Write an enzyme that holds these catalytic residues in place. Structure first.
Site, short mmCIF file in Angstrom:
data_model
loop_
_atom_site.label_atom_id
_atom_site.label_comp_id
_atom_site.label_asym_id
_atom_site.label_seq_id
_atom_site.Cartn_x
_atom_site.Cartn_y
_atom_site.Cartn_z
N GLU A 112 0.82 -1.21 0.00
CA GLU A 112 0.00 0.00 0.00
C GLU A 112 0.86 1.26 0.00
OE1 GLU A 112 -3.02 -0.15 -0.74
OE2 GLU A 112 -3.43 -2.27 -0.41
N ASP A 141 22.05 -1.75 -3.51
CA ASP A 141 23.33 -1.42 -2.89
C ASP A 141 23.99 -0.31 -3.69
OD1 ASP A 141 26.41 -1.73 -2.63
OD2 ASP A 141 25.67 -2.95 -0.93
N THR A 148 26.28 -3.79 -8.71
CA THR A 148 27.40 -4.72 -8.87
C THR A 148 27.69 -5.32 -7.50
OG1 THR A 148 28.32 -3.49 -10.74
CG2 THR A 148 29.79 -4.97 -9.58
N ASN A 201 35.70 -11.24 -8.81
CA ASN A 201 34.86 -11.89 -7.81
C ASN A 201 35.68 -12.80 -6.91
OD1 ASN A 201 32.92 -12.36 -10.66
ND2 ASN A 201 32.37 -10.85 -9.09
N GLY A 224 33.66 -17.92 -12.78
CA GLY A 224 34.10 -16.58 -12.44
C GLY A 224 33.71 -15.54 -13.47
N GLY A 279 37.14 -10.86 -15.97
CA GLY A 279 38.10 -10.35 -15.00
C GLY A 279 38.83 -11.45 -14.25
N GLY A 284 36.55 -24.99 -1.89
CA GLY A 284 36.24 -25.60 -0.60
C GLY A 284 36.57 -27.08 -0.62
N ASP A 286 46.94 -21.45 -25.76
CA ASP A 286 46.93 -20.63 -26.95
C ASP A 286 45.67 -20.98 -27.73
OD1 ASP A 286 47.35 -19.22 -29.21
OD2 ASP A 286 49.20 -20.23 -29.79
N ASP A 310 47.13 -16.97 -24.83
CA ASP A 310 46.08 -15.96 -24.71
C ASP A 310 45.13 -16.31 -23.58
OD1 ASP A 310 44.54 -18.05 -25.75
OD2 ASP A 310 44.21 -17.11 -27.68
CA LIG Z 1 33.19 -27.45 -2.30
CA LIG Z 2 37.54 -14.78 -14.56
CA LIG Z 3 29.60 -3.46 -5.05
CA LIG Z 4 27.76 -1.91 -0.41
CA LIG Z 5 37.59 -28.82 -3.50
CA LIG Z 6 34.33 -12.18 -12.59
ZN LIG Z 7 -2.91 -2.73 -4.16
#
Ligand SMILES: [Ca+2]
Ligand SMILES: [Ca+2]
Ligand SMILES: [Ca+2]
Ligand SMILES: [Ca+2]
Ligand SMILES: [Ca+2]
Ligand SMILES: [Ca+2]
Ligand SMILES: [Zn+2]
Ligand SMILES: [Ca+2]
Ligand SMILES: [Ca+2]
Lengths: 463, 97
Positions: free
Chosen positions: A170, A282, A324, A344, A357, A360, A367, A439, A447
Site C-alpha cells: 500500500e 546497494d 554490482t 569476484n 568466475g 576479470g 572448498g 593458446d 592468450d
Molecule cells: Ca566445495
Molecule cells: Ca575470470
Molecule cells: Ca559493489
Molecule cells: Ca555496499
Molecule cells: Ca575442493
Molecule cells: Ca568475474
Molecule cells: Zn494494491
C-alpha cells in the site's frame, strides 16, 4: 550446452533460467524488468520536487483520531495503528527510502514538505484487506488497513508475512505504483490467467496479486510459504524510474544473508531454516552474498538483474538492475556460483560445487569436496587478468574449458607450436603454484592463463 | 490487496475432482492445524505424491508435500472453490463439500 560438459550445461541452464523478454511465459508476454517497471508506473502519477532539492521529502502521521469527514466515507469503525503496526510500517517505509530518492519523516504536514502521508485502520471492507491513493489524487498520501473480528492479518505484521508485505504494497501505491494488471480485490474474481505479462507474480513485485508459484518459484519451506517484506526487483526499477536511485544506501562494503551487515530484517539470515526473499539494492563498495549457513543445494548468480535459488527455495533472491555485487559464499550443499564482469571472490564451501568466475581476474575457492571451475570465454582468464584457484586440489577438483573448446580437447605440449588449443602445464614449487597456459587463437603465445594454488595436472582438466 | 483466508476459515470438508471425470471425487477434511484427514491419500492418483500440509495464500492455496517445500498451487476462483492443473492440462476442482 551443445558440445559441452554436463557441468557447463548446468551453469548455462541456470544463467538463462530466469531470462525475460521476447517470448511467452504461461501464455503471456514475457516482460523485461524495464517493461514491468513501465507497467507498474502506467498511471503517470508522481510526487513532485516542489522545493527543488532533487528529492521527494515527505511527512507522515499515524492517525490518532478519525480525520474530518471520516463517517462520510463509510469505512466502519476507525482504529489507530498499534505499536507493532507503527514499528513494521517504519521498516516498510525505510525499505522504499533505501532504493529511491524519497524520504519519510514522521510529523505533521509542514511548509518544507513535498507532501504528507497518513496511516490508520478501518473495519468495514467491500473485499480489500487495505487500500491507498495514487499521488495525483486529492487523497494523495493516504493508506488504510482493514481490521475487524474476521480479519486480523493486519494486526500482526512481521518479517516474511503478509501483513508486512501489505504495508510495503500500500505504501507502494502512495508512491505511484499500480497493480501490474487492471484488477482490484472485491471487484469480480480476478485471475492470473488474465494477467498482462507472465512475470506478474509475487516473485517479481510486491504489487502483484498472484502467487510466485504461478511462475515456478518455490518460496515454501518447512510446510509454509513466505512473502517479501521489501520491494522486489521490478518494484525497485519502477520506483527508481519515478524518483531516481538512492546511491547513498549501503555504499561501503556490505554483507547480505548470513553475517549480514545490511542492518535490515529482510536481508538477514541466522539459521538454516530461514526463508529469505529479497532483491539487493546497494550503492557501492565491495559486497558479498553470504549464504554459508544453508545446507541445501543453492544456485547463486551475481549478475545484475538476475535471480538465485537460495536456502532450499527457488527464485527467491535477486540483485537489482544497476547493482554490482562482487562476492558470494555457498553453503555445505552442492552449489552453483556464477560471477559477473568484476573481480569476484567465489567460495563454494563444503559439498561439490561448480564455480564460474566470468570476466576479470577472480579468486575462486572450491572448498572441500570435488569442485569444478567452469570457463566459457577466453577473456574469462587472460595472462594479464588471470583467475587464481585459491585452494585447487589436484586429483579431485576439475578445470572445465568445454564452453570454449566444445570438447575438441587440448594439445598438451612443452612449448607452444602455433596451433589453436596448444596448452602448457607448469608447476612452481616455491610458490606451490600451478599454471595452465593455453593458446586458443593459435598465435604461438598464451592468450589464456589460470593460476592454481596447489599443483594442477593434465588429468584435472576437462576440455 | 486480497484478503488472506485464515486456516480456521478454510478448514472443513472439501471435495476434489478433475473436470471431465466428475464421478471420481475425493472428499477430504482440511484441519485447522493445516493437516489433512487420511482420505488425502485419494489425491495420490492425480498428484503423484500426497500432500501433508496446506497453506492459504491471498489468491489461492498451496498443498505442500512431505519435504515441507514441494507444492501444488490452486487459485481461488470464487468463494469455496479453488482450481489447479494436474496431469498436464487437466483441471482439478476443489470445492466445499
Ligand atoms: Ca566445495
Ligand atoms: Ca575470470
Ligand atoms: Ca559493489
Ligand atoms: Ca555496499
Ligand atoms: Ca575442493
Ligand atoms: Ca568475474
Ligand atoms: Zn494494491
Ligand atoms: Ca524536495
Ligand atoms: Ca557448497
Amino acid at each position: 550446452a551443445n558440445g559441452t560438459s554436463s557441468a557447463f550445461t548446468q551453469v548455462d541452464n541456470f544463467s538463462h533460467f530466469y531470462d525475460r523478454g521476447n517470448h511467452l511465459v504461461n501464455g503471456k508476454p514475457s516482460f523485461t524488468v524495464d517493461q514491468a517497471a513501465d507497467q507498474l508506473t502506467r498511471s503517470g502519477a508522481s510526487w513532485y520536487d516542489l522545493n527543488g532539492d532533487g528529492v521527494i521529502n515527505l511527512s507522515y502521521t499515524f492517525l490518532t483520531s478519525p480525520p474530518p469527514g471520516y463517517a462520510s466515507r463509510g469505512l466502519g469503525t476507525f482504529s489507530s495503528f498499534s505499536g507493532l503496526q507503527k514499528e513494521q510500517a517504519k521498516l516498510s517505509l525505510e525499505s522504499w527510502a533505501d532504493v529511491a530518492k524519497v524520504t519519510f519523516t514522521e510529523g505533521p504536514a509542514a511548509r518544507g514538505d513535498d507532501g504528507h502521508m497518513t496511516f490508520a485502520n478501518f473495519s468495514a471492507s467491500n473485499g480489500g484487506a487495505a487500500f491507498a491513493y495514487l499521488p495525483n489524487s486529492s487523497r494523495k498520501g493516504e493508506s488504510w488497513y482493514l481490521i475487524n473480528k474476521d480479519y486480523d492479518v493486519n494486526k500482526t505484521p512481521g518479517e516474511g508475512n503478509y501483513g508486512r508485505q501489505t504495508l510495503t504494497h500500500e505504501i507502494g501505491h502512495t508512491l505511484g505504483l499500480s497493480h501490474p494488471g487492471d484488477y482490484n480485490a472485491g471487484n469480480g474474481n480476478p485471475s492470473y490467467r488474465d494477467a498482462v505479462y507472465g512475470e506478474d507474480t509475487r516473485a517479481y513485485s510486491v504489487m502483484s496479486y498472484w502467487s510466485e508459484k504461478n511462475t515456478g518459484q518455490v518460496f515454501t519451506k518447512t510446510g509454509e510459504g513466505a512473502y517479501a517484506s521489501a520491494p522486489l526487483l521490478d518494484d525497485i526499477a519502477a520506483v527508481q524510474k519515478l524518483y531516481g536511485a538512492n546511491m547513498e544506501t549501503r555504499a561501503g562494503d556490505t554483507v547480505y544473508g548470513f553475517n549480514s551487515t545490511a542492518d535490515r530484517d529482510y536481508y538477514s539470515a541466522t539459521s538454516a531454516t530461514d526463508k529469505l526473499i529479497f532483491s539487493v539494492w546497494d550503492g557501492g563498495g565491495n559486497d558479498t552474498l553470504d549464504f554459508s549457513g544453508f545446507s541445501q543445494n543453492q544456485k547463486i548468480n551475481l549478475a545484475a538483474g538476475s535471480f538465485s535459488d537460495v536456502g532450499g527455495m527457488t527464485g527467491n533472491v535477486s540483485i537489482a538492475q544497476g547493482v554490482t555485487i562482487e562476492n558470494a559464499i555457498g553453503g555445505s550443499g552442492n552449489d552453483l556460483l556464477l560471477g559477473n564482469a568484476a573481480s569476484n571472490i567465489l567460495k563454494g564451501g563444503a559439498g561439490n560445487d561448480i564455480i564460474y568466475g566470468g570476466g576479470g581476474a577472480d579468486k575462486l575457492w572450491g572448498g572441500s569436496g570435488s569442485d569444478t571451475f567452469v570457463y566459457r570465454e577466453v577473456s574469462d582468464s587472460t595472462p594479464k587478468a588471470a583467475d587464481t584457484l585459491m585452494d585447487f586440489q589436484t586429483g579431485l577438483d576439475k578445470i572445465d574449458l568445454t564452453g570454449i573448446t566444445h570438447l575438441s580437447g587440448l594439445n598438451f605440449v612443452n612449448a607452444f607450436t602455433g596451433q589453436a588449443g596448444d596448452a602448457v602445464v607448469s608447476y612452481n614449487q616455491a610458490s606451490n603454484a600451478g599454471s595452465l597456459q593455453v593458446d586458443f587463437s593459435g598465435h604461438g603465445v598464451a592468450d589464456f592463463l589460470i593460476t592454481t594454488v596447489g599443483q594442477v595436472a593434465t588429468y584435472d582438466i576437462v576440455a | 490487496s486480497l484478503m488472506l483466508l485464515s486456516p480456521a476459515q478454510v478448514a472443513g470438508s472439501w471435495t476434489f475432482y478433475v473436470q471431465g471425470a466428475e464421478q471420481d471425487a475425493c472428499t477430504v477434511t482440511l484441519k485447522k492445524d493445516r493437516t489433512f484427514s487420511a482420505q488425502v491419500s485419494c489425491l495420490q492418483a492425480w498428484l503423484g505424491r500426497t500432500p501433508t500440509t496446506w497453506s492459504p495464500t491471498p489468491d489461492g492455496l498451496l498443498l505442500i508435500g512431505k519435504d515441507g517445500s514441494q507444492s501444488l498451487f490452486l487459485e481461488l476462483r470464487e468463494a469455496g472453490r479453488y482450481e489447479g492443473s494436474v496431469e498436464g492440462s487437466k483441471t482439478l476442482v476443489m470445492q466445499r463439500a
